[PDB]
Amino acid sequence: SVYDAAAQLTADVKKDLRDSWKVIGSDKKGNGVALMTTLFADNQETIGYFKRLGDVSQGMANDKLRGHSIILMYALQNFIDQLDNPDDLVCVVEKFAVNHITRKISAAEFGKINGPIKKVLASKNFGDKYANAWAKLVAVVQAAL
Amino acid sequence: SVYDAAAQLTADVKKDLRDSWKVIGSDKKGNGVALMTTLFADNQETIGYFKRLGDVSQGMANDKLRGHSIILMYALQNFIDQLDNPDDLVCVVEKFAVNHITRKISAAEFGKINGPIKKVLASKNFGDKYANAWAKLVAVVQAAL
Ligand code: HEM
Ligand code: HEM
Structure with a gap:
């Protein structure tokens, strides 16, 4: 369920999400x-x-x-x-x-x-660690579908 | 037709919109x-x-x-x-x-x-000048409807 999926966004996942969004969201x-x-x-x-x-x-x-x-x-x-x-x-x-x-x-x-996100991340030198953090945020939306 | 209503967003209108948004959007x-x-x-x-x-x-x-x-x-x-x-x-x-x-x-x-926007602007002490500018931005959307 979505409340449970939101709880998988731990401190390091949140930080990696912000650090990569600072470049992607520019x-x-x-x-x-x-x-x-x-x-x-x-x-x-x-x-x-x-x-x-x-x-x-x-x-x-x-x-x-x-x-x-x-x-x-x-x-x-x-x-x-x-x-x-x-x-x-x-x-x-x-x-x-x-x-x-x-x-x-x-x-x-x-x-x-997720595949598109991993590739845009990779083009900005954000590796697997970041692709996986973003997969956890997409999983919060998936739990609501 | 949206381009024509967007032409009404002149330099001073855009400035008032950006300055009030600095506060409202925060x-x-x-x-x-x-x-x-x-x-x-x-x-x-x-x-x-x-x-x-x-x-x-x-x-x-x-x-x-x-x-x-x-x-x-x-x-x-x-x-x-x-x-x-x-x-x-x-x-x-x-x-x-x-x-x-x-x-x-x-x-x-x-x-x-527009009435709601005017009231929220005035609560943050943005007067009629700013309300006017926001009515012109809403008019661009209205032109698309
Ligand atoms: C990172 C993932 C995604 C984000 C943030 C996202 C975001 C949005 C947003 C904000 C809209 C406009 C508001 C709305 O109508 O709901 C939208 C529209 C739409 N989304 Fe998603 N979406 C995502 C992924 C997907 C995927 C994977 C599909 C389908 C395979 C999808 C299909 C649609 C469709 C069909 C529209 C309407 C397009 C149109 O006809 O204008 N979205 N989405
Ligand atoms: C400043 C003006 C407004 C903005 C920026 C705005 C923005 C949005 C956005 C971003 C959505 C979500 C995406 C979508 O489903 O289209 C939405 C949904 C909607 N808007 Fe607007 N809207 C505005 C004014 C209005 C007004 C004046 C009405 C009608 C009296 C209206 C009725 C709706 C409805 C019924 C929904 C769906 C709500 C729901 O989830 O059940 N909107 N609007």
Whole structure:
């Protein structure tokens, strides 16, 4: 359950999340768009959920994709900012989960974002330690789906 | 058409928005809930759109309303951050608008948030000049609805 999954965010996980977000979150447009095109490249079957975005291979030049990618990064910003207070983290994760549940995005489907995250981290010289901290935050959202 | 309403955000308007946001956005939970509870108090009929939140009379103590309130404030953070690049502001506002159009929230209904914003600004002693600027930012969204 999500209260139990939020409890796996221990002190070192929280610190590694903030330390990597300080670099990733510096360029929300650039890293958000890179996140999404890596998801589409590595997991082409997820493009069906994003029909409204139009031609996803245009990347940055697709205004709808660029708008979605920037907004996605503010949801991550929000989660990072709630790490101090588990009660606020949980109520924000459950609120966020509503629209993903309506779209029938399962926990297994959501978990496909981990591969893209690991790759964007790796491009900024953040290794496995950080990829695993981010997998634990994505697991809090998965528990709400 | 959003680009035309965005043209109204002149250099002084953007400056007032950024300066008031420096204070308002520094307590996203507190000021987010104050906007929402002021909206419900002043325009009781808007509660019709928020049946999922349950008992909105609990204010801050209602986890679903607190979750919604914090997420609302990250949408405004995003808008403030895109003010200097009209192309990004417009693709973010148009993406944001999609779910509100599906909820059948008209431009007039959305415009009811202006009284709440004026009151939260005035509680932090930002007068009519700042309220005016915020009405012009809300107008960019209204142009997308
Ligand atoms: C790091 C993970 C993710 C974050 C932070 C995230 C964030 C968001 C945000 C903030 C929105 C806009 C608000 C809303 O409509 O709910 C959104 C929309 C959406 N998300 Fe997620 N999401 C993530 C992963 C995923 C994944 C893995 C899928 C599906 C395979 C997914 C599918 C969708 C879809 C289909 C939309 C709507 C796109 C549109 O038509 O405009 N999301 N997501
Ligand atoms: C300053 C203005 C506003 C901002 C920045 C804002 C922001 C947001 C955000 C970020 C979401 C979550 C993503 C989504 O589902 O679309 C949302 C949801 C929603 N908004 Fe807005 N919104 C604003 C005003 C309004 C107004 C005036 C109404 C209607 C009277 C409205 C009704 C809704 C509803 C019903 C939801 C879903 C709530 C739920 O989770 O059940 N919004 N809004």
